[PDB]
Amino acid sequence: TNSTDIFNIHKDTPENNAATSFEFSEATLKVVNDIIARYPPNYKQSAIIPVLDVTQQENGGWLSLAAMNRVAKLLDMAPIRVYEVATFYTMFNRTKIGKYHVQICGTTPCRLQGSQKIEEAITKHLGIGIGQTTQDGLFTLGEMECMGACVNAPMVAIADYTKGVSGFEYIYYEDLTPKDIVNILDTIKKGGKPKPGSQYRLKAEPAGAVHGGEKWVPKDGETTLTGAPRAPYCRDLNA
Amino acid sequence: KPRLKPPFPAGVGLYGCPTTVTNVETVAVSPTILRRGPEWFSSFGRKNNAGTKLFCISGHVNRPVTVEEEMSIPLKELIERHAGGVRGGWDNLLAIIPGGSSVPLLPKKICDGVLMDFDALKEAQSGLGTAAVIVMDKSTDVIDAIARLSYFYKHESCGQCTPCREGTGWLYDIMTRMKKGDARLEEIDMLWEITKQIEGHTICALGDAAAWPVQGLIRHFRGEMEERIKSAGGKKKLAAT
Amino acid sequence: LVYDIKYFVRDYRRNNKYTARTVDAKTTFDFDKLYAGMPTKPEQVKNVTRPLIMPTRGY
Amino acid sequence: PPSDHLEVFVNEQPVKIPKGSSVLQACDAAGIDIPRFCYHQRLSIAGNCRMCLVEVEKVPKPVASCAMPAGPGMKIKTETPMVKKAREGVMEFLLINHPLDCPICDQGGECDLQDQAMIFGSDRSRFVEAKRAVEDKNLGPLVKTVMTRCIQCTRCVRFASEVAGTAELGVTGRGRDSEIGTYVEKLMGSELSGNVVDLCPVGALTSKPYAFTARSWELKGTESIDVSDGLGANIRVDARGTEVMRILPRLNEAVNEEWLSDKGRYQYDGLKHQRLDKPMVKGPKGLQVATWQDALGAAAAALTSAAPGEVRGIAGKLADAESMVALMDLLRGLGAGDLAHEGGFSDMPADVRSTYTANTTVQGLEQSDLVLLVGTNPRWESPVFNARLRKMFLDGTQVGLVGAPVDLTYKYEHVGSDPAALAALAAGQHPFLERLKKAARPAVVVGPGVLRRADREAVMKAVHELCGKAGVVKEGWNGFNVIHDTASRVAALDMGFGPSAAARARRAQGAQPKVVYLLGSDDYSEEDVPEGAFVIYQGHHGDRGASRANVVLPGAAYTEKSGLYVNFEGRVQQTRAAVPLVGDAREDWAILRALSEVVGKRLPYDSHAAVRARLAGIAPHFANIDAVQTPVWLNGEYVKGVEALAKAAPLQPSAPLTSTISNFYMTDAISRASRTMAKCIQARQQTK
Amino acid sequence: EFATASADYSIAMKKAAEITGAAESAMGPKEGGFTAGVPLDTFTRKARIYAPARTASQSGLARTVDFATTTPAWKIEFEPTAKWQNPLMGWTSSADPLENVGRSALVFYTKEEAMRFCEKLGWEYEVTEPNKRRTQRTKRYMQYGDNFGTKRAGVPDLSTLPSN
Ligand code: SF4
Ligand code: SF4
Ligand code: SF4
Numbered sequence A: 001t002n003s004t005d006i007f008n009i010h011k012d013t014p015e016n017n018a019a020t021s022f023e024f025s026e027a028t029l030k031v032v033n034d035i036i037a038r039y040p041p042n043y044k045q046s047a048i049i050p051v052l053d054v055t056q057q058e059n060g061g062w063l064s065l066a067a068m069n070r071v072a073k074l075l076d077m078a079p080i081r082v083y084e085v086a087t088f089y090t091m092f093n094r095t096k097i098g099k100y101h102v103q104i105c106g107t108t109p110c111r112l113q114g115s116q117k118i119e120e121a122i123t124k125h126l127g128i129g130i131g132q133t134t135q136d137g138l139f140t141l142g143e144m145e146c147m148g149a150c151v152n153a154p155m156v157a158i159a160d161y162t163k164g165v166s167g168f169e170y171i172y173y174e175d176l177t178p179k180d181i182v183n184i185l186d187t188i189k190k191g192g193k194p195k196p197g198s199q200y201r202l203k204a205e206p207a208g209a210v211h212g213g214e215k216w217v218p219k220d221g222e223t224t225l226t227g228a229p230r231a232p233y234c235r236d237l238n239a
Numbered sequence B: 001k002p003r004l005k006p007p008f009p010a011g012v013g014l015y016g017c018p019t020t021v022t023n024v025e026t027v028a029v030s031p032t033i034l035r036r037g038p039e040w041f042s043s044f045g046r047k048n049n050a051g052t053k054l055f056c057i058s059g060h061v062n063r064p065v066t067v068e069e070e071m072s073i074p075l076k077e078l079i080e081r082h083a084g085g086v087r088g089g090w091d092n093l094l095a096i097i098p099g100g101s102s103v104p105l106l107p108k109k110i111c112d113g114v115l116m117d118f119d120a121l122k123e124a125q126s127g128l129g130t131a132a133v134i135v136m137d138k139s140t141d142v143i144d145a146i147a148r149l150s151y152f153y154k155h156e157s158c159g160q161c162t163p164c165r166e167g168t169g170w171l172y173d174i175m176t177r178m179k180k181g182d183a184r185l186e187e188i189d190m191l192w193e194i195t196k197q198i199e200g201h202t203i204c205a206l207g208d209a210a211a212w213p214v215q216g217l218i219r220h221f222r223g224e225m226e227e228r229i230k231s232a233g234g235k236k237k238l239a240a241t
Numbered sequence C: 001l002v003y004d005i006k007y008f009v010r011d012y013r014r015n016n017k018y019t020a021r022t023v024d025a026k027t028t029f030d031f032d033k034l035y036a037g038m039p040t041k042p043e044q045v046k047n048v049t050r051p052l053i054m055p056t057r058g059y
Numbered sequence D: 001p002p003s004d005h006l007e008v009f010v011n012e013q014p015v016k017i018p019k020g021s022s023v024l025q026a027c028d029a030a031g032i033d034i035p036r037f038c039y040h041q042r043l044s045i046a047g048n049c050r051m052c053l054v055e056v057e058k059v060p061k062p063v064a065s066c067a068m069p070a071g072p073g074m075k076i077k078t079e080t081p082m083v084k085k086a087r088e089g090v091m092e093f094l095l096i097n098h099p100l101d102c103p104i105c106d107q108g109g110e111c112d113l114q115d116q117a118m119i120f121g122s123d124r125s126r127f128v129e130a131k132r133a134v135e136d137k138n139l140g141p142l143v144k145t146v147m148t149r150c151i152q153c154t155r156c157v158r159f160a161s162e163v164a165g166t167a168e169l170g171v172t173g174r175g176r177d178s179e180i181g182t183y184v185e186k187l188m189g190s191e192l193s194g195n196v197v198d199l200c201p202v203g204a205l206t207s208k209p210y211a212f213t214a215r216s217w218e219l220k221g222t223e224s225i226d227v228s229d230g231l232g233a234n235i236r237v238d239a240r241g242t243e244v245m246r247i248l249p250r251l252n253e254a255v256n257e258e259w260l261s262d263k264g265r266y267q268y269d270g271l272k273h274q275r276l277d278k279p280m281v282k283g284p285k286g287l288q289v290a291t292w293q294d295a296l297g298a299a300a301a302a303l304t305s306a307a308p309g310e311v312r313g314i315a316g317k318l319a320d321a322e323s324m325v326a327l328m329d330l331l332r333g334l335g336a337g338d339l340a341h342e343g344g345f346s347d348m349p350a351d352v353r354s355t356y357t358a359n360t361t362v363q364g365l366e367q368s369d370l371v372l373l374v375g376t377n378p379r380w381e382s383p384v385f386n387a388r389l390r391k392m393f394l395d396g397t398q399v400g401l402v403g404a405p406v407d408l409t410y411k412y413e414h415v416g417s418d419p420a421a422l423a424a425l426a427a428g429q430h431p432f433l434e435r436l437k438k439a440a441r442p443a444v445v446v447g448p449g450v451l452r453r454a455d456r457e458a459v460m461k462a463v464h465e466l467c468g469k470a471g472v473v474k475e476g477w478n479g480f481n482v483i484h485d486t487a488s489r490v491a492a493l494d495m496g497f498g499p500s501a502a503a504r505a506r507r508a509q510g511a512q513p514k515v516v517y518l519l520g521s522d523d524y525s526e527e528d529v530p531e532g533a534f535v536i537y538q539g540h541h542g543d544r545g546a547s548r549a550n551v552v553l554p555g556a557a558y559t560e561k562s563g564l565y566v567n568f569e570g571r572v573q574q575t576r577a578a579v580p581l582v583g584d585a586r587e588d589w590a591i592l593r594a595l596s597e598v599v600g601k602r603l604p605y606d607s608h609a610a611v612r613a614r615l616a617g618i619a620p621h622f623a624n625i626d627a628v629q630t631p632v633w634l635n636g637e638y639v640k641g642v643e644a645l646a647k648a649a650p651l652q653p654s655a656p657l658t659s660t661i662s663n664f665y666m667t668d669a670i671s672r673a674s675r676t677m678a679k680c681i682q683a684r685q686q687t688k
Numbered sequence E: 001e002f003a004t005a006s007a008d009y010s011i012a013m014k015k016a017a018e019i020t021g022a023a024e025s026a027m028g029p030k031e032g033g034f035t036a037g038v039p040l041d042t043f044t045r046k047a048r049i050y051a052p053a054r055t056a057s058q059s060g061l062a063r064t065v066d067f068a069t070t071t072p073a074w075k076i077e078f079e080p081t082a083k084w085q086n087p088l089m090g091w092t093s094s095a096d097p098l099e100n101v102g103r104s105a106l107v108f109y110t111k112e113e114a115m116r117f118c119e120k121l122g123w124e125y126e127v128t129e130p131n132k133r134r135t136q137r138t139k140r141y142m143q144y145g146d147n148f149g150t151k152r153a154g155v156p157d158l159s160t161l162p163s164n
């Protein structure tokens, strides 16, 4: 379960009903058939989670009933198993979203660093809360648990669905202030590419920190692995 | 959704076949251990606690970092060097979770002296876990932090078994009431009893991982919880009269 | 009992026992001990006082 | 064997159990009944309710006794303080989100959650937060859902996957928001879909036709048998006075395990409509109410004024053995011989009981590794028997079918569809014969649609040749089985209820009767009841047979009498009266004894015991109730004896071997009057 | 060691049933009905001796023949007689004196005890042995580990692997 999906049962919509059609393109069908070959033929059902992910980029950022039924027919499994998998996992959107899916981490290591102020900045700028889409159909705001980027807290991940399967981008933006996330949102809206990763350092190397969620404060100190890398070496395996 | 053990994955695992699940960091250090020798690897750290370890230091720290270090290093050494120390000095420290989120927190008195080690955090009523270090300072509402941890464990429950599925939401509701002080003093002992009812009674270890932070919060900051309850009546009993 | 609700520590209904004694055949009833604990003077007579209330178990 | 029974210790008592048994089974063998919510004997083990937690020595945690295997020398404790604390804690977790619904819930009074809370739980709660609320689901006309009462035991999901075979339920969502059902609006389409209401331990899934009508403590329960098909499932009828309120299955591992089809469970509401409660005689105004003396006199006058060759008696699908032997003896005492059965093949030879019964029996069929079905649809003939066939499929028994292809909820190999395919299988043209020839215990099941055919003798000869070549019947194993779909057919074959040679000849040249006795018959053919004949109908529902009759004599239904019925494996079972007789109706054999007195030739029996003794005098196995003999097998001597019936009426190799049941929900007069069965058909019609 | 319900008053009930002189009391057939003083046509009715099966709605086994030595489970039942509706209110009327006496009051530990009661009272009886439960599970899903075995779809073929 995620935001934007308050139902664990199907609700009919003119956009989302049993009459709606889904079909793969040629290249997406090639991708899906390449995914299936990673697994034994009598355990072909192992491929459901990557195939459903690929179907989610193909359909435009969300899974419809027709897409799930097509995936069920493709993997030769009952549709209720597919509905179980699609409702179980957090990334699978089952209602229509915007072009870019903005997901903010809210767990305690990001919360100490001031993720609440980043949420406040996003809501003041875009004009929407968590679980909502803008009136232009551009941004969808969501909340996530810990994203495994806690040393660069506080962070936002943004998913790109404007290019389909071939140009799918899931980009982490880290070490943020309100100004950084406002600039990233403006850069995306204007058509540019904001810089990935941390906004004040390269990686998880020792440098400063965001103090109070509003200002980066650089700090100098001991850094490891600053010299030349180690040479190849092996001991004598005989005796 | 996890299976019950027995059977064990090395007996019946993936597709009914023998299977071993191992961590990335466990797998990656093996070629260096085989090339450089087991005696080289066991020369670091205490007995039964051998080798080196990646440590992630996050939270109220001047220089948050993923850094490799020898095991059995003290917390104060591991934080003051390699990470620039606690934001505002070491005397501004309030609490530290030493092993991710599933292990109980430690206060300032235990942290000054304890070694970051398997057989040293366990005797301090905690655990090394994944060696992920989260630091809070004296501006932190520690009840609010553990309440967000309770929200995480409610959100991440798979719902298969009765105690985890029903009681993580109950723990979250009780913690949310405790944050505002809208509770009774004996509800703290009730909260400890509910964590003891979840822990050890579930299919997998997420129930224990949901009970353990609340146990550490109660054990090391029961006075803070009692003061939060008592001082809330300075803004709730002025309307009753 | 508002917040301490555990029942098996106060399950008086289901915790009583009946035990079959060993077969009362070759026991030793000594009447000397029975009549040796009885008084013979007016003072040294001891009386069992009447119970004031039946057990309430604190409630 | 290397000590195939291992010894464990339950509360310091030594217990011997079979190998592979769990801790819960060891506790059950010690006389301790461990509380449980998700474990079931017939389902796979889940281990998710955490109620079965016991203590094992040298284990610091409580173990789940349903899933934990029992090792040698294991020490189990079921009454320590940690076991009781575990039980109270798990019950408290089960009750925090449950709705305060016991007054409006139908399980109240027979609820596992209520009783287990009373015994193994506490008396208080400390929970004052808001509860979880769930919307209800639509699963058809037989299953009612109030899903706020679900406790996530997943018994329904395991049942639908493993026994029903449809696999349409699942758990959607995660955590506290896990939710049982179908993601889209669907209808539960299994014939065995009322059993999941029994399997649900709470009032999340209740019976929609039964809803809000009774509490369980008010019901007088009677153990009877089911007559809606030929298996004879063992049931319990619950009544409040004169009215039957519900029907439930009861355990019989040799017949039906614990299941019952939806027709046998829900057709009881047809007993409240169109009932015959008074005798009627047709006058110039029409049928009008008459006394029993007048109705018996009119029937006797019509039976005596006609010649003996102009009288025919037809037995219905639900006639017990006592009424059938009474009608047979009464018609034979008048010099008549025209006896017919509503279930067809009335001229079938009934000389050896092994030729029209299941020699393997129902429980003995589980020892077969390969099963060949010939011309049968077991899913519509007996869904409980088909469930046992699916159970055999799940642990390795392979199934092949010669007949029309049907949905059976398990995979089978379609050998063919006509008797030409059967002959090709017997010769060796199909590779399934080599699969049968190498099988250790092969089995052949022949359905009733084969016996209804005009060329049934040639087909049975081909089946006998196939069984002889494939080793189906040998020393130590008899794998030849013939099943039926009607309750009264095997008893009529057992007693000799069949037409004489003169009556068969008179039907061959086209003689037509003038007096017809309809013993509960409403699905007779038009060749057997001519227009302008005198019709005596004896039955319990007003239907096609009563609208045409001149004399109506009201009898008892199977919920009102104790009659004998024999299933297709040869087992003699009996109904029992759960309610008294309705109105001015009588016992069914008693009407025929009174009518034999009014005619002028009394039957020689005056009591229920005496007519049962007459039945035991005809065939002695009738006296052994709830048991089955081992029938004699005469090899190919019987087939050699009836070769004249094979030469006459030759084989039709192009007509497909099909099943005659085209309406599963409405097969007799009771199920045709049931409004629940009509809603069941309407639900399958409105989905297209 | 011996411990078969050894913590309740039922120990003091099993003995007092085997007191000498009183454990061997016996009467001839139909003799107890002559001295009972109830009308003699009551003993022309038929009785059933049986142990009722477990209800399908619940899973507990306490009211079955599994706990036969602990609890009396055998019953005596009679056939129904006529019932009709009251014209004024609609209540169910009856003329049966044995309408609830066998189902409420008469319970026995064994089948032979109920037979002995019927024989000395003069009731003709039929005995119905209950159907025995089976404890052995199916070959599939015999243990919890067979849910995840190789019997689901066979051993996986390693022919879709890279390098085949
Ligand atoms: S403890 Fe929680 S996550 Fe683990 S099996 Fe039980 S419900 Fe699922
Ligand atoms: S299932 Fe129904 S009867 Fe049972 S406890 Fe819940 S509300 Fe009460
Ligand atoms: S509906 Fe009944 S059987 Fe199904 S999971 Fe819920 S409680 Fe269990």
Ligand code: FES
Pocket (backbone or CB within 6 Å): A105, A106, A107, A108, A109, A110, A111, A145, A146, A147, A148, A149, A150, A153, A155
């Ligand atoms: S807490 Fe935000 S990335 Fe882990």
Ligand code: FES
Pocket (backbone or CB within 6 Å): D035, D036, D037, D038, D039, D046, D047, D048, D049, D050, D051, D052, D064, D065, D066, D067
């Ligand atoms: S009965 Fe064993 S966990 Fe449910």
